[PDB]
Symmetry: D2
Subunit: 249 residues, 4 copies
């Protein structure tokens, strides 16, 4: 049971693999390579919402891969030092760009100097007297480093969402993921779609547009119900191609 | 007139700077750094739709930066060789991961071996006898390289969209960009919004959700009109915070 | 205090007045037609009137809806009347004896399956008391259930209506515009200023947004211009912030909105 | 061929029949009430009937709407009649001479500002010919414009209605259900199977989706159950693919849909 995910050890992907469903781990260098692998009858963990995905949504649409589960990662950044450098000894920090913005206020509270690095790995490289790396919690410790502080990010409940993927359309599910594709351009296509679910009061937890026409990624809090089959009928009558790409709990 | 954008010379950002509004160029290492700079009373070019942006949408929301123009880049990949290696001499190619997926069929038509590289710069490094780099057209030539072929991507009209940004809320505009933020959670908030514009038949060219609540990025094909002021009134009555973040032609 | 309604005695209006009011807290004042009823309420400051508003079986509610639109009169309550009928005869006859019935037109129309099942011959009369005067051996009157006993007659048969849940809704009306004020249903007049496609949907979509039920929706033509309409709507809500929201939205959409009623 | 309508001669129905038909392609058959009209059309296979459907000023359209719902009768066309009135007198009198008018109730209600401006005293009569019989020195009849000249009288004054664009819409009805077939407006009966909030909006929202205008929307109560309704809708469209789409959607939403009319 090969579990393909974005590596190396210590990424968000790996953290969510581990911290959630604690199973032979197979790290991949980026996501194209993890989707390919999954699409051998194996498993994959891979982000969809707000990561630090075109590719993912896209393979989901190709029917190369299907979503059987969800995992929501508590985004969290730590500060890693050289071993009892105390926080007040940190002169300078090193982190990738998206993480500097996640933690820009922390940098400021403390008036750290800072600059950028291609990797969290490279962040760890820079650690020395008066130098700390901002990286995800649970991640510096893969390579023997101990946080100076933790929950470092400016905003309190930032979350990334991860899908469990397979090459198996094998979906008692109580959340459903749909690709809804317009067969022609007209005004208000997204509106059509949202309104059809809202007829039936089917709450949509997540919705996404992707290509100047767009197709639609929607996720609904509800089981396979007769109401769901109705909105499907209506959408098809409205000219939407409808394929279910996820079903889970 | 410092023009801040994502570098180095030969990125999509730079290409759109150049090919569109052909002006003192100031390349930046990534986008956080270009938004900061813009937010000195200067200019910025920066992508919003489908790039190969959390950060961008986010600064637009902070009112740190405002959009005064649009540029749509014809995505396009070329094949760069060592100088009359003909296409049939290419054994292997090197490119970043998102570009391999853009061109996966081209790789296959020709049965190239392939692997990944951190950069287009690094792609160019690998060029030798029997080795070619897949990179954006107009980009290998910044560093003296000539395409083996061009329009290499699998799908024909992929496009990225770029905003012209400023630290100036100084908006005769005929496209309008709004941040619409819900003051509370209830079902169908996005629906509310789309339906209000559709009352007035105001076509929305682009719409985006971002944070488990969401705020909304919408762009409307219409001027500052009395109808637009109406939908604004309605949205405020519905409890949406409304700020205009873009206005252009 | 005056209670105007459509007479003569034994109409459905009259019955609604009996069901819903004491004779010893109102003086009953029958009028000849609905125009007169509304006119009397309009001019008598210590009056109410009871007037059909939904599912009349005789005569149009438009005249009532127009009085309300022009604010000649105001709605201060509603009452629902079951529309049921009986067969009234000579005290002797059984149903097997009846050869012929006489009835007002509205009553025939509601009891036609009845009339047919029984193969009665029939003819029309101008009023229920008229009906009653045709009674003799083998002749019956079809009348509002309980109207024959207002004149000293007895049914041969009752509950003879063809449908069981036919209900006419009446308004209790007054010439004063000041309403109960823990009101739990609201009536609005809503008038578009310009012609636009989908005006009614607009209105209904707005109330749905705040999940507020409409128990009644009526339209009437402007009459001052071809093609234009106004809307009558009754909402199950007290006057709340949600309600002020829909009015604001409707006004932004260029409808004028006015409360024409409020009660329980 | 029979043309049933509400009499006697000189009603608005009668006038609509004159405006819209030859006497020499129909035999005119007045009936006493709308129930009789609909009943005659229902039983006469070579018949039409002309019957009010929108903006009646006298008497309810519900009976017509119910006949249509039960498919006793079918709509094969519509005609619009201007509702206008004249003052009819003794050939001698001028308006300055008139002390008193007599009129049917519906006519008083539409000419009341008129009556008031001129300070006529008035009273009611049961029909326009009755009106006409009250005429003498200082006494006039208010009647449908062109109905006095059906009996040999002349107006003292015309176009005396208080509003200029009051229009009653009539249906041309038949007991056969087979329609014109380059039809450009469609009438549907649409009935929900279950009670749900926002049923009417559902229907209207569905037609809007395909940008199809509704020129008329009416509701009627089920009557077999409390609380339930059916919907009458007239759509400006021929029978197209868009139309088949809305019906499919409506049926998916658990309405039954049936064509009750189709014409131009
Ligand atoms: Na009953
Ligand atoms: Na007129």
């Amino acid at each position: 049971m090969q579990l393909y995910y974005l590596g190396p050890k210590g990424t968000f992907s790996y953290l969510a693999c581990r911290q959630y469903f604690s199973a032979t781990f197979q790290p991949k260098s980026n996501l194209f390579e993890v989707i390919k692998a999954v699409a051998d009858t194996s498993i994959g963990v891979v982000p969809i919402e707000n990561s630090i995905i075109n590719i993912v949504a896209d393979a989901l649409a190709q029917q190369d891969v299907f979503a059987h589960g969800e995992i929501r990662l508590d985004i969290n950044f730590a500060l890693y030092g050289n071993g009892t450098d105390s926080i007040s000894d940190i002169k300078k920090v090193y982190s990738i760009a998206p993480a500097i913005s996640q933690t820009t206020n922390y940098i400021h509270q403390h008036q750290f100097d800072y600059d950028y690095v291609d990797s969290t790995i490279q962040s760890l490289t820079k650690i020395e007297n008066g130098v700390a790396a901002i990286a995800p919690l649970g991640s510096g410790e893969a390579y023997g480093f101990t946080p100076i502080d933790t929950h470092i990010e400016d905003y309190p409940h930032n979350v990334t969402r991860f899908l469990v993927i397979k090459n198996q359309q094998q979906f008692n599910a109580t959340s459903l993921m749909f690709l809804i594709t317009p067969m022609h351009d007209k005004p208000g296509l997204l509106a059509s779609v949202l309104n059809t679910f809202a007829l039936f009061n089917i709450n949509l937890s997540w919705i996404e547009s992707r290509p100047g026409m767009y197709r639609f990624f929607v996720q609904a809090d509800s089981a396979i119900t007769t109401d769901i089959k109705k909105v499907i009928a209506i959408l098809e009558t409205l000219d939407f191609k409808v394929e279910m790409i996820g079903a889970f709990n």
